[PDB]
Design a protein around this ligand. Structure first.
Ligand SMILES: O=C(Nc1ccccc1)Nc1c[nH]nc1-c1nc2cc(C[NH+]3CCOCC3)ccc2[nH]1
Length: 252
C-alpha cells in the first residue's frame, strides 16, 4: 500500500543496530508519525527477518492506549520501513536519566498503565519479554506506550530466572519484569545490575536484590512479591492493580 514517496522525512528520532527512526509526515494527510528504517541488508546479516514480521504481526493486530500503534510497513530494494505511531515525549529511559529517579506516584502510575497494557496482551496470548525503559515511550498525555516486539512470543537485566536458566516460561515472565521496572523507577537502576553478564546471571539466578532505605515499605512489598523466583508465586496483574500501594499512589 504505502511507498516512500508518500512521506516527508524529518528530524531523526533514533539510532540502533539495524537503522534509524525518523519523524515523518504523510504527504496527503498531513499525518505525523515515526518511520523506523531497517535494511534488507542488516536484517539478513544478523538474521532476524522471522522476528520482524512477527513484530509486524503482533504490534499490528494489537490495539491499546499504552501500546505503540503500528500502522503499517513497506520495503523497497535496499530496505524495510515501519510506520509507527509517534510518541511526543520520548522514552521513560531518558526521563529517568534526567530525573535519575521517579517518585512513588509516578512509578505507580506507570506500573498500572503498564499492568493494563500487559493485561491486554496476555488476554490475546502475547508475551513481550523485553520491557526495558529504553522500550517505553511517552505519549502527549505523558502516558506509557510500549514499543518494540522483536522478542515477543543481549542484556539480561530484565529477564527472569526461568528465561535466563533456559527453562519453561509462560506469561509470568512479564510480572518479573514489571517488578524490575518498578524497582528501577524508584531506585534509578535495576535491582540486578552488575558489571558483567556473568555476575548478572548469578545475581538474577539467586534473586539477590536489596533496597535502599528510602524505599517505602509498601514498595518493597510489591516488588518482592513480583520478584519471586518461582513463577507461580507471582501476583496477578489484577492483584498488582489492586495492590494498596498501587491504588494509594496511582494518579491514573
Ligand atoms: O521507534 C522509536 N525508536 C527509538 C529510537 C531512539 C530512542 C527511542 C526510541 N521511537 C519512536 C517511535 N515512535 N515515536 C518514537 C519517538 N522517538 C522519540 C525520540 C525523542 C528524542 N528523545 C529521546 C530520548 O528521550 C527524550 C526524547 C523524542 C520523541 C520520540 N518519539
Amino acid at each position: 500500500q504505502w511507498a516512500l514517496e508518500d512521506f516527508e522525512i524529518g528530524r531523526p528520532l533514533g539510532k540502533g543496530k539495524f537503522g534509524n527512526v525518523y519523524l515523518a509526515r504523510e504527504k496527503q494527510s498531513k499525518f505525523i508519525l515515526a518511520l523506523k528504517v531497517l535494511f534488507k541488508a542488516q536484517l539478513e546479516k544478523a538474521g532476524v527477518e522471522h522476528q520482524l514480521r512477527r513484530e509486524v504481526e503482533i504490534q499490528s493486530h494489537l490495539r491499546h492506549p499504552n501500546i505503540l500503534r503500528l500502522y503499517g510497513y513497506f520495503h523497497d530494494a535496499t530496505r524495510v520501513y515501519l510506520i509507527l505511531e509517534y510518541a511526543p515525549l520520548g522514552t521513560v529511559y531518558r526521563e529517568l536519566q534526567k530525573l535519575s529517579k521517579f517518585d512513588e506516584q509516578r512509578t505507580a502510575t506507570y506500573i498500572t498503565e503498564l499492568a493494563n497494557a500487559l493485561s491486554y496482551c496476555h488476554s490475546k496470548r502475547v508475551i513481550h519479554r523485553d520491557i526495558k525503559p529504553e522500550n517505553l515511550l511517552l505519549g502527549s498525555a505523558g502516558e506509557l506506550k510500549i514499543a518494540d516486539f522483536g522478542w515477543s512470543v543481549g542484556t539480561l537485566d530484565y529477564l527472569p530466572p526461568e528465561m535466563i536458566e533456559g527453562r519453561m516460561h509462560d506469561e509470568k515472565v512479564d510480572l518479573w519484569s514489571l517488578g524490575v521496572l518498578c524497582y528501577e523507577f524508584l531506585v534509578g537502576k535495576p535491582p540486578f545490575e552488575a558489571n558483567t553478564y556473568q555476575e548478572t546471571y548469578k545475581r538474577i539466578s539467586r534473586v539477590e536484590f536489596t533496597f535502599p532505605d528510602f524505599v517505602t515499605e509498601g514498595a518493597r512489598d510489591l516488588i518482592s512479591r513480583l520478584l519471586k523466583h518461582n513463577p507461580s508465586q507471582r501476583p496477578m496483574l489484577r492483584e498488582v492493580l489492586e495492590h494498596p500501594w498501587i491504588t494509594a499512589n496511582s494518579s491514573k
